[PDB]
């Protein structure tokens, strides 16, 4: 039920405990007026401060002039904050606008092409994103819908993704959730309490070269289809060999308990965990924060499902990219396909009631 | 925690409404009646496991290394979560297995209605399974595993996820709001109302289809909302569309949500006025639908709405007259019916030896 604080050095929704639901929206900018865009960021911030406290935006959902559309669309009336977080990010394409070219962060690297991808361009990229996470899906949709409405005429929704259930953990003291392949996903991640690891691996620092991004992070989103029919035909041992962990307990091969440290050399050479581990990737460590999805059927008799992968890191070049490169030979590749992608620079936090999303970028 | 699976009636009709839905329509590929009965028995056994929070078959792990696990594993560590699994039989089922004359007359095909825009690929179906639970992953796991168990005998035609309230934080007695921001459910048949269920929801033997006694008939409509145009309407326009105020949800002229409506005070094509039993020869529904939000369409607009479900004793005396009377509804400007199906939902699984469809198949 409770609220997650909206203000801080960092935006919430990163280190925060992972909530049950996701509504992620990517927007494109339509206005060429920088002052109008700044005004939108401030109005959006004000809205987010209301939303994340369980309050209606603007002057509320009713009680205004009868002839006026309500300021808030009303479907969150009577609900709780439900741990809603709203996290904004700026895509590389934003920096072509508003005289921002020289402020594009070097750590906001475009991804290379990866073997096997079939990326839907229409559901990739975006000038900006808002990640809405909450325990109540109606709270999350209300937030996105009202931000979109506020932004009408200045931004448009390019694409969106709903996540029905989490597949990630920033809280190793709680149960690790399972993805739709049936495996625990999030055992060896980064905890919200691991201050030093967050500083090392997640938060941008001023000396990294982009002052406005200090206390921000960089986000990679990958929409990944799962080949459920093929997976579900695989043997237990094939599935366990793919990952390098057993399925029921989720321990590394040869170990009895989920959180026992892996002995990588006992895994298959191609195993996902072996290839993805920091030790395989120059120490590169990610904060994974994704969710599962299911998008109807394939039209031909089969349920369609997948995982909407999210990773936060201090630098895309030393986080996602080396890891995904090392997954070129991953045994998992037989059962997945990346079908959408985007990257964003997620600014530092909203410091207090007078601050606003993007203030360090825009001034 | 759990809702009992066995009973005179299938659970998921009159039982308390859960927070989440995974609804699947299936088409039958087998022509062999004995093989189909064998599937119904296997599905029943699976449903007994699933609704008690247990893995299907021999489980999700621990079996022979070389064998695919019987259960795909994504519900391990979760709870029963009030899961119910409710099966229904579409009109098209009855053209198989020599069942033709056992198609109930109360399982009427819907007429075409003004403004319909039905996607035929997301309509119909030989069978349905309505999975409802508080944890969406529990519902998805159930549908995924039933589909897996049935593969070779059935395929999935279409699939819809939905949500209502989140009961951890929202009082059970509080009426849900739909995505237009209005309370939705105020005047409905509740599963507590045993006498009203016998009048309006359960099929009786005397109604003409003995195998259906204690079953019900289900209408599903996938109803998209034009969210952005709705949100541009004034508060008074919105309230006029329904005949209730938005904040409290009281009828025009009344102070409280649950005060009985005075229909004459509503506009003549207000939704409540057109939908009320008094306007429809006494026709009364058990509405049991769920909101949906599926994404953004190819114009940037929200793909969202109501996955409307109604249970009734006879489609001809329930949904059809009411929907016909919505032809001039002021709501029509803001909605579009884009998927549809009907199903005969049999009586319950009476005990541990019984199986879904036993009254139909014998
Ligand atoms: C549908 C796709 C994916 C599935 C099903 C999946 C599944 C898993 C599972 C079951 C684990 C073991 C438990 C744990 O989190 O420690 C794991 C670990 C991991 N995954 Fe994935 N994963 C997927 C995609 C990716 C991608 C795209 C990346 C990065 C490019 C990635 C990076 C990692 C990392 C870094 C670990 C932890 C390794 C360690 O330090 O022990 N995963 N994944
Ligand atoms: C997206 C579409 C729809 C929306 C947003 C909607 C919304 C509402 C709302 C807000 C109410 C008032 C509160 C309540 O008593 O539940 C209501 C009542 C009702 N609706 Fe709808 N409805 C929709 C579609 C339908 C359809 C398709 C039918 C049947 C064909 C239907 C039948 C009813 C009935 C019977 C009532 C109760 C009237 C009474 O007895 O007072 N609705 N609906």
Author numbering:
A (entry chain A): 55 to 417
B (entry chain B): 56 to 417
Authors' description from the paper:
Dye-decolourising peroxidases (DyPs) are a distinct structural family of peroxidases possessing an α + β dimeric fold that houses a b-type heme coordinated on its proximal side by a His residue. The soil dwelling bacterium, Streptomyces lividans possesses three DyPs; two belonging to the A-type and a third belonging to the B-type sub-families. The two A-type homologs, named DtpA and DtpAa react in their ferric heme state with H2O2 to form a two-electron oxidised derivative that is an Fe(iv)O heme carrying a porphyrin π-cation radical (Fe(iv)O[Por˙+]) – termed compound I.34–36 In the presence of a substrate, reduction of the porphyrin π-cation radical results in the formation of compound II (Fe(iv)O), with a second substrate molecule reducing compound II to the ferric state.
The Y345F variant, creates a DtpAa protein with no Tyr residues within 15 Å of the heme on the distal side with the double variant, Y345F/F347Y, mimicking the distal heme Tyr arrangement as in DtpA. High-resolution X-ray crystal structures determined to 1.23 Å (Y345F) and 1.27 Å (Y345F/F347) resolutions, corroborated the desired amino acid changes. Not surprisingly, the fastest hole hopping pathways (τM 10−3 s) in the Y345F and double variant remain dominated by the proximal Trp/Tyr dyad.
